Target: Large ribosomal subunit protein uL29
Amino acid sequence: MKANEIRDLTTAEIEQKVKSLKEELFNLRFQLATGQLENTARIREVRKAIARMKTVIREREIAAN
RNA sequence: GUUAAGUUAGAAAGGGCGCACGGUGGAUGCCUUGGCACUAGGAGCCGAUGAAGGACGGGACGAACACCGAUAUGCUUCGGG
Model:
């Protein structure tokens, strides 16, 4: 997964992919708060995903600049 | 069993001296995760590309330490295991 963010398209698809898993994160926090989420570690790994694959965007932008 | 007058062990409310067994308390013994004085070498600055230092906040519960900064208990990317 540490490579796919570079391998796939430059910037376009990562954007709505960010918004999609941010949707997932919001849903995860809501089910956590109401006390129904089971697979907890999902909450960690989605945030890790967000961090890494917007870090990729930042480094790509600065490198291009 | 009476006179009569003489003589003395006897006691324990409690207490004193030793003996035994306990409590408390943290002395002494032993130890060290800290500290002191120094030797040899490196280094002797940081800051508007925002410092030193903080407040606030981040974790599958929530406080505190430590780490971190809304990419928040971390990440990408060269290595070592």
In short: The two ends of chain A are 25 Å apart (CA to CA). Residues 40 and 64 of chain A are 37 Å apart (CA to CA).
